[PDB]
């Protein structure tokens, strides 16, 4: 069957040795509040050394999580919190449910670092709405 968030948290302790460069694993999307949406935060040092012996180490996380969580790895979407937009990091911090965390306060330090204010989101909305309106004017629709 589908695993609950509780057993996902317990099974995630096996990730420290399977994914040694992993520092935080957060579940977001439909499963938290369908496909499995995970946000990962790598240790910048270990991942660089890991890529020397693994040319595509980032793309092996879904296969590793699938064998550990006993879920279909073909329905797993991974988001790199190390190199993503400020908008994606905001909603991951706002609605995400942390599954793995080292240290025990990494998710709090992540939320304090990436959470946007309502005014900052409004400014982002205004820029994208202007971009959309400009597209509509150029295309004559």
């Amino acid at each position: 069957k589908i695993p609950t968030i509780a057993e996902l948290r317990e099974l995630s302790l096996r990730l420290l040795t399977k994914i040694p460069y992993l520092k935080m694993l957060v579940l977001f999307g439909s499963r938290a509040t369908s496909d499995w949406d995970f946000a990962v935060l790598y240790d910048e040092e270990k991942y660089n050394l890991y890529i020397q012996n693994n040319p595509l180490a980032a793309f092996v996380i879904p296969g590793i999580l699938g064998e550990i969580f006993k879920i279909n790895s073909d329905k797993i979407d991974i988001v790199e919190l190390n190199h993503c937009s400020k908008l994606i990091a905001h909603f991951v911090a706002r609605d995400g449910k942390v599954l793995y965390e080292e240290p025990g306060d990494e998710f709090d330090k992540f939320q304090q670092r990436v959470l946007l204010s309502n005014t900052e989101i409004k400014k982002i909305e205004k820029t994208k709405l202007e971009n959309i309106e400009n597209f509509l004017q150029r295309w004559g629709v």
Binding site: S30, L87, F91, E125, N131, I132, F135, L136, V141
Partner: protein, 141 residues
């Protein structure tokens, strides 16, 4: 419950993909069939356009019909029932779900003659999709 900034991000991407797809609007069928490179570009563009729309449709329906599941084809039709899209546009653009699956099908083996027709379809219908979703976001205040 709908996050407009998430939808606006995807509408912005659709506009950027359409601007690149527009560069192929005047290519003849013969020149298109002789260029494998131009086929790969248009196939990838059409895949990203349809997937971005599927992402928007699921986000809207997850807040208007929470817990309800919709296929990608029925998602376009459901937006037409609620006048988010006009029923005319919803019926004309609904086959884009079949185009999406053909572009990502395991069997692959897509027909470039059918992709050629999809270029003219997307350049005409998806600008209207951007307009109508944009009007829905403005109505949401």
């Amino acid at each position: 419950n709908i996050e407009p900034v998430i939808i606006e991000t995807r509408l912005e991407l659709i506009g950027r993909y359409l601007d690149h797809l527009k560069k192929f609007e005047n290519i003849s069928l013969d020149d298109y069939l002789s260029s494998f490179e131009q086929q790969l570009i248009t196939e990838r563009l059409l895949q990203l356009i349809t997937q971005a729309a599927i992402d928007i449709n699921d986000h809207i329906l997850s807040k208007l019909k929470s817990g309800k599941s919709y296929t990608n084809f029925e998602a376009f039709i459901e937006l037409g029932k609620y006048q988010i899209l006009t029923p005319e546009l919803a019926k004309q653009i609904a086959p884009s779900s079949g185009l999406r699956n053909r572009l990502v099908a395991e069997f692959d083996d897509i027909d470039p003659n059918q992709v050629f027709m999809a270029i003219s379809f997307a350049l005409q219908q998806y600008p209207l999709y951007v307009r109508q979703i944009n009007s829905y976001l403005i109505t949401l205040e």
